[PDB]
Design a binder for this molecule. Structure first.
Ligand SMILES: [Mg+2]
Ligand SMILES: [Mg+2]
Ligand SMILES: [Mg+2]
Ligand SMILES: [Mg+2]
Ligand SMILES: [Mg+2]
Ligand SMILES: [Mg+2]
Ligand SMILES: [Mg+2]
Ligand SMILES: [Mg+2]
Ligand SMILES: [Mg+2]
Ligand SMILES: [Mg+2]
Ligand SMILES: [Mg+2]
Ligand SMILES: [Mg+2]
Ligand SMILES: [Mg+2]
Ligand SMILES: [Mg+2]
Ligand SMILES: [Mg+2]
Ligand SMILES: [Mg+2]
Ligand SMILES: [Mg+2]
Ligand SMILES: [Mg+2]
Ligand SMILES: [Mg+2]
Ligand SMILES: [Mg+2]
Ligand SMILES: [Mg+2]
Ligand SMILES: [Mg+2]
Ligand SMILES: [Mg+2]
Ligand SMILES: [Mg+2]
Ligand SMILES: [Mg+2]
Ligand SMILES: [Mg+2]
Ligand SMILES: [Mg+2]
Lengths: 31, 80, 85, 120, 101, 64, 19
RNA sequence: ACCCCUAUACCUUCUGCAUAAUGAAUUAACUAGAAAUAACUUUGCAAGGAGAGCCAAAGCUAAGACCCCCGAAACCAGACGA
RNA sequence: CCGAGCCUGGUGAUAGCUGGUUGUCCAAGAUAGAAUCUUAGUUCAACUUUAAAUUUGCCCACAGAACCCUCUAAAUCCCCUUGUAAAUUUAACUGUUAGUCCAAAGAGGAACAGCUCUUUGGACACUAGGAAAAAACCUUGUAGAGAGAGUAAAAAAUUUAACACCCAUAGUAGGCCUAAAAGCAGCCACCAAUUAAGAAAGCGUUCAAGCUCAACACCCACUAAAAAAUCCCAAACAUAUA
RNA sequence: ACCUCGGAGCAGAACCCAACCUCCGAGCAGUACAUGCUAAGACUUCACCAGUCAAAGCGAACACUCAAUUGAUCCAAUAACUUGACCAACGGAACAAGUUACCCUAGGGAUAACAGCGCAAUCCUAUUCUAGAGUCCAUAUCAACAAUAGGGUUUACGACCUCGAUGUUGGAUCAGGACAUCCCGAUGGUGCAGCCGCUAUUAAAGGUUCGUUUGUUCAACGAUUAAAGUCCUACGUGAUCUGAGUUCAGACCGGAGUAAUCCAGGUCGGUUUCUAUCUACUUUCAAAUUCCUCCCUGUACGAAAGGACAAGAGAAAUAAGG
RNA sequence: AGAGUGUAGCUUAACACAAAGCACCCAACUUACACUUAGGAGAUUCAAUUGACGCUCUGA
C-alpha cells in the first residue's frame, strides 16, 4: 500500500519506465 | 476510486514531450548575442509609448453642435 | 486526416488555406466576377499584417547588428588612435 | 512550495545528433520564430499567463512571429510547454512591397511571396 | 516581525538621510559616505549610488572583545565584512560669474 | 543553490587541521600590517577601490 | 549571500578554537 | 401525441458546496431605497456670484443625480377587572 | 395563555438576529491584515468600481543582499535590454473577507496516517468537453446563427511452487569431564588405510545400536494467500494491416 | 492558568507569515545633567494612533548602556515647568456580582446513519517467522519478539482527580441478511484402541429453551437442551406497542454554597397526538427437521472399566399445510 | 678527486632615490608569558658573464 499519486504524476511514472533492449534474434536461438 | 493509465494516455503524453523537445532545440541557437541585442528596438519601443501617452492626454469632452440642438424641433414636423 | 495533410504541406484543416476556401464561391452567370467575400478580405488583411511584421522584425535585427559592428569598429579605431605621442 | 522553475543551461545546448534530427545548423541560425499556443493557460500559474499575454498568444492555434534573440527566447523558455516553436523559412526573399498583399504562411513553416490558387 | 532589512539594494539612487538598512546586529557595516544610527541602522550621508563590497575588517583598538578575537587569529588570517558605500553623484558645487566688476 | 568561488577564497591557504601548532598574531599591529597588505592586493570580488579609484657608492657610504 | 561565490567570505571562528 | 436522444425544480441561508436546510396548494388584488456634506454632469454670470444674510486666491448661482419592508420577549404611564 | 393580569397609550419601541426586497439589456468585478465587552458585528487598510491627470508599469541581465549555529532546498528581493500596455497620482463611493478542495513545503511536548493551522500555486463560488454519476482532478476559456471541418483531454494491467539415482569399509568406542557420551551433553586436536568417506553436516538412542548427507564408481538432467451483512453487476470479445 | 511587551523552535536565502501549543523572560536599573535648541531626508510591527533613525545649523565640549523594562482621551493638581492608573480585560466604559430544574425571546448547531473519508499509535483476527512449551519432537495442540493483510478504537497538549456520550439503550411483534458454524451434514490431521474429545476444510437448507437475581464493572444462579452461535440491518423495527436513561415543573436525604440555588450523587411522584396522499407489500409452495428408544449388541474395539459406525424398526417434539 | 652550487636565520627584497622586510637579544611592566615602551647587533666569498674560497653528495 502506497499513498495515492496525482494522475499527472502517475502518467509521468508510466511513460518513464525502463524498456530493456530486444535483439533481432534471441541469443539462445543463435549458435 | 483508483485511476489507471491507458495506452492512449501514454501516447498523448509522449506526443507532447516530442513537441517540447523540438522546442528546446530551436531555443538552443540564438541569432544575436545579448550584447548585440542591446538597444536595437529602443527607438521603436519609445515611440510606441509616446503613442500611448498621446491617447491618454487627448482625453477631453466632445464638441457640441448648434445643429444637434435645433434638429430636435423636427419632432413636430408636419404636412400642411 | 490532419496529419497526412500536414505531411503533404497542406493545412491540417481543409477549411484552412487552399483553393477550396480561398477561391470565390460564386460568379455572375454572364461572367462578371463576384464582389470579394468578407472572410477572404479579413484573411488577406491578417496575412498582409503578418508579412509587414516579418519584414519589420528582420530589418530591426539586421540594423541592430550593423549598429553593433559600427560600435566595435569605433572602439578599435579609438584604441589604435590613442597610441600617438 | 510550488515556485518558478529555473532551467539549467545544459538543456538548451544542442548535440550533433539533434542537428541531424531537426533540420538546423549552429552556424547561420534562423532569424525568426513561429510560435503557436497549443495548450491552455488555465490550471497554469499567473506568471505563465502573463508571459503568454505579452507574446501575443492569447488565442490558440494562431501563428505569431518573434525575433530569435536572447530576451524573447527567455520569455519563450518560461512557457515552452504551452507552445510550439518552428523556424520561419523563406524559400524566396522576405516579402517586397509589390508582393506584400499576396502572401501565405504554409504549414511547413515557409512564407511564400506568391500565392495564386492555381495548381502546378 | 520588526520589518528590519535592506531598504536600498545595489545601484539604487539615494538622497542624504535615506536609510539603507536596519539590522539589529551588524550584518552590513557602514563604509563610505554611510552613517550609522544608534539602533545600528545604516543611512546615506550623501546623494549617490549604493554599492556593496567585501573589505578587510580592522576594529578600533579600544574595542576590547574585537581586538581579543584579532589577537587569537593565525598569522595569515584576515577578517572580511560586507560594507555599504554611497558613491556621490553630484559635485559639491560650481563656480559661476555673478558680477562683471 | 550555491556557486563556487571565482578565485582563491581568503584564509584558505592557512587553513590547517592543527591550529594550536600554528603561530598567531599576539599584537594588534601585526594583524593591521597584514590587513593593509591584503587591502592593496587585487581581488575578484567587488572592492572599494573599484568605485572610488654602484659598488663604490656603497663602500663610501659604509665608510662614512 | 548564499547563492553568490562570495558566500562565507566573512567566516571567522573556524580559524579559532575557543574551547 | 407517445416511443428515440439530451436534461439532478425554483427562492433563500450557511466562511465554500448543493443535491442539505428555509419558504411557497393555486389565482386575483395589495405589499418593501425616504436625505445631506463633499464630489461629478449641464446651464447663467464671472474676480466676482447670489432677488439683503452667505461664499469667493475661478468662484458663485441653479438644476440633475446616493441612503428599504415585516417580526420579539420587554419597560413605563393611565384606566379596567375578585 | 401569571417568575408577576388585562386594555389603551408612549409605539412605526428596540432587535449587530431571522425572513423578504418587484421592468429589460450590456459592461468591469473574489479571499493580505490591524483594532474592537471582539471573532453572527463595525472602523481603517487590502482588493474591487467609476471619472480625471500624468508618465512609466509589467516581463526582467551582468553586478549586488551574514555571520553565528555547522550546516540548509525549491526559491526570493533588486534589475538594463527586450517583449509588451499598462501603471501611478487625483476626485468620489459603496461592497467582500474563520473561504472549500487539490499539488508542494512545513508548524502544533522530536505523533511518517488523521485533526488543527501557516505559506506558495492551481481550480472552484463563471463556460463547455472528459474521468460512471462527480464544486475543487484533466482538457478548455469572451459569448450569435449553420443539417461543415481539424483537434484537446479521453478505454488499466495481471495468473505463480515436481525433482536427483547410486552407495557407504575402517585406524577407534580420537583423547579429557562424565554412571557412559562411543560422530551428534560440553572442551581441544582435526590426522589417517584403501582407489574412494568430514575424528561427521542433519535426524535417532540414558549411552549403544540405526536412517540419511558430503565421499568413489555409474552418466543421468535439474531446473506463492483471503473474508460481511437487500441482489453478481454493462453486454461481450484473445486472430484483416494506427 | 491565560489576555500587554521582548526572545527561540519558526519560513532554511529581501520583508511578512505557524492559530492552538512548548518553553523562556519584562513591568527595571545604572551613568550623565547641553538626557540643550533647531532642522534636510528617511524607516515603520502590514490601517490609524503610536513608535524609530538622522545630515546640516545655533549654543556647548575638547542627540548614554541595556531585547522588552510600558498606557490614549477626558479629568484632577499646578503661577508656570510639569505630574497623576498592577486603566495588567494592557486601543483603556468614571463607578455594577451570583443564580434560574419557574424561566422567556431572537437565532445557530446538532437534529437522525456521516461530520475524523486512501493508515501513525493501540486491540482483535488470519498468515509468515521457528525462539520456546508439549516426556524426546516447531508445526496433535499452544506459542515470545516481531512482520504482513483485514476489521475496530484513539490522537495536537493543564504530561491535573474526574465522567462523559444520550431518538442513548432494553423488552414485545415481525423479522431481512452475513459466515468469521453453536447444533444438525460431509471430510483431513491427532499426543484418534472405542465412547467422549482437540484442531482444520467444506456447508447458512433447518434450528438455536424456560425461569430467577444473596455476592459479582457488560456478571451470575436454577433447571434443561442436539445446540441454547458471533454479528450487520438508522436501539433493525416507537405514523405497530411498551421499561428505564438523557430529564427536567413537586418533594426529601448526603455534600456544596452567606443566600438564591447546585450536584458531574441517591430516592419518591410525573401528558406526545396522527382520519394513510404516494412508493412498497398483502395464500412463491410442492419437496421438513431433530431428538429419544429398540435391533445390530451388548457387536467391533479394549487387559478390564467401558463401549461404536453403517442398515433397519418404533415413538415423540417442533415447523409447514389441512 | 668529480658534480651541484653561493645575501645576517628566512625571502625568484633590491628598476631605482636603496643593501630592504620579518626573524633575534638586552632593559622596564609581568610570579611568569604575551603586549607595549626604551636600546643593541647584524651581511651580496673574493678577482676580472667567467675563474678560484665555503657548503652537501659520491671514491679509500
Ligand atoms: Mg411549506
Ligand atoms: Mg366581590
Ligand atoms: Mg366573589
Ligand atoms: Mg425593526
Ligand atoms: Mg463581464
Ligand atoms: Mg474594550
Ligand atoms: Mg460580541
Ligand atoms: Mg455580532
Ligand atoms: Mg526594470
Ligand atoms: Mg478550514
Ligand atoms: Mg551421496
Ligand atoms: Mg505602516
Ligand atoms: Mg500579527
Ligand atoms: Mg550635528
Ligand atoms: Mg479589552
Ligand atoms: Mg485590548
Ligand atoms: Mg498593539
Ligand atoms: Mg425542582
Ligand atoms: Mg444544520
Ligand atoms: Mg437545525
Ligand atoms: Mg523444548
Ligand atoms: Mg460520536
Ligand atoms: Mg430470520
Ligand atoms: Mg466457512
Ligand atoms: Mg445494533
Ligand atoms: Mg417507525
Ligand atoms: Mg400515583
Amino acid at each position: 500500500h502506497r499513498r495515492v499519486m496525482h494522475f499527472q504524476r502517475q502518467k509521468l511514472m508510466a511513460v518513464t519506465e525502463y524498456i530493456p533492449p530486444k535483439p533481432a534474434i534471441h541469443p539462445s536461438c543463435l549458435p | 476510486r483508483p485511476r489507471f493509465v491507458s495506452l492512449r494516455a501514454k501516447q498523448n503524453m509522449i506526443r507532447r514531450l516530442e513537441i517540447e523537445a523540438e522546442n528546446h532545440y530551436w531555443l538552443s541557437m540564438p541569432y544575436m548575442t545579448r550584447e548585440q541585442e542591446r538597444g536595437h528596438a529602443a527607438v521603436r519601443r519609445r515611440e510606441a509609448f509616446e503613442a500611448i501617452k498621446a491617447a491618454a492626454t487627448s482625453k477631453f469632452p466632445p464638441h457640441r453642435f448648434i445643429a444637434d440642438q435645433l434638429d430636435h424641433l423636427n419632432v413636430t414636423k408636419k404636412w400642411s | 486526416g490532419g496529419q497526412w495533410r500536414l505531411q503533404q504541406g497542406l493545412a491540417a484543416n481543409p477549411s484552412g488555406y487552399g483553393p477550396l476556401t480561398e477561391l470565390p464561391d460564386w460568379s455572375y452567370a454572364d461572367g462578371r466576377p463576384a464582389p470579394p467575400m468578407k472572410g477572404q478580405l479579413r484573411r488577406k488583411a491578417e496575412r498582409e499584417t503578418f508579412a509587414r511584421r516579418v519584414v519589420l522584425l528582420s530589418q530591426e535585427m539586421d540594423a541592430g547588428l550593423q549598429a553593433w559592428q559600427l560600435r566595435q569598429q569605433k572602439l578599435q579605431e579609438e584604441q589604435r588612435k590613442q597610441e600617438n605621442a | 512550495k510550488f515556485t518558478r522553475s529555473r532551467i539549467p543551461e545544459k538543456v538548451f545546448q544542442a548535440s550533433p545528433e539533434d542537428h541531424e534530427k531537426y533540420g538546423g545548423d549552429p552556424q547561420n541560425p534562423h532569424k525568426l520564430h513561429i510560435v503557436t499556443r497549443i495548450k491552455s493557460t488555465r490550471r497554469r500559474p499567473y506568471w505563465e499567463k502573463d508571459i503568454i499575454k505579452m507574446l501575443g498568444l492569447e488565442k490558440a492555434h494562431t501563428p505569431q512571429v518573434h525575433k530569435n534573440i536572447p530576451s524573447v527566447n527567455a520569455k519563450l523558455k518560461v512557457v515552452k510547454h504551452l507552445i510550439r516553436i518552428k523556424p520561419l523559412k523563406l524559400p524566396q526573399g522576405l516579402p517586397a512591397e509589390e508582393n506584400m498583399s499576396n502572401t501565405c504562411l504554409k504549414s511547413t513553416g515557409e512564407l511564400v511571396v506568391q500565392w495564386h490558387l492555381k495548381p502546378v | 516581525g520588526r520589518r528590519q532589512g535592506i531598504k536600498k539594494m545595489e545601484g539604487h539612487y539615494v538622497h542624504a538621510g535615506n536609510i539603507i538598512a536596519t539590522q539589529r546586529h551588524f550584518r552590513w557595516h557602514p563604509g563610505a559616505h554611510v552613517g550609522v544610527g544608534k539602533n545600528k541602522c545604516l543611512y546615506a550621508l550623501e546623494e549617490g549610488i549604493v554599492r556593496y563590497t567585501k573589505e578587510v575588517y580592522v576594529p578600533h583598538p579600544r574595542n576590547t572583545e574585537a581586538v581579543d578575537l584579532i589577537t587569537r587569529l593565525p598569522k595569515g588570517a584576515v577578517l572580511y565584512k560586507t560594507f555599504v558605500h554611497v558613491v556621490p553623484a553630484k559635485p559639491e558645487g560650481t563656480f559661476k560669474l555673478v558680477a562683471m566688476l | 543553490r550555491r556557486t563556487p568561488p571565482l578565485g582563491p577564497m581568503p584564509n584558505s591557504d592557512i587553513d590547517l587541521s592543527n591550529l594550536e601548532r600554528l603561530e598567531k598574531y599576539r599584537s594588534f599591529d601585526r594583524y593591521r600590517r597584514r590587513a593593509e597588505q591584503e587591502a592593496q592586493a587585487p581581488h575578484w570580488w567587488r572592492t572599494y577601490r573599484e568605485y572610488f579609484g654602484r659598488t663604490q657608492q656603497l663602500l663610501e657610504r659604509k665608510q662614512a | 549571500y548564499k547563492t553568490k561565490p562570495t558566500h562565507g567570505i566573512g567566516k571567522y571562528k573556524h580559524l579559532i578554537k575557543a574551547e
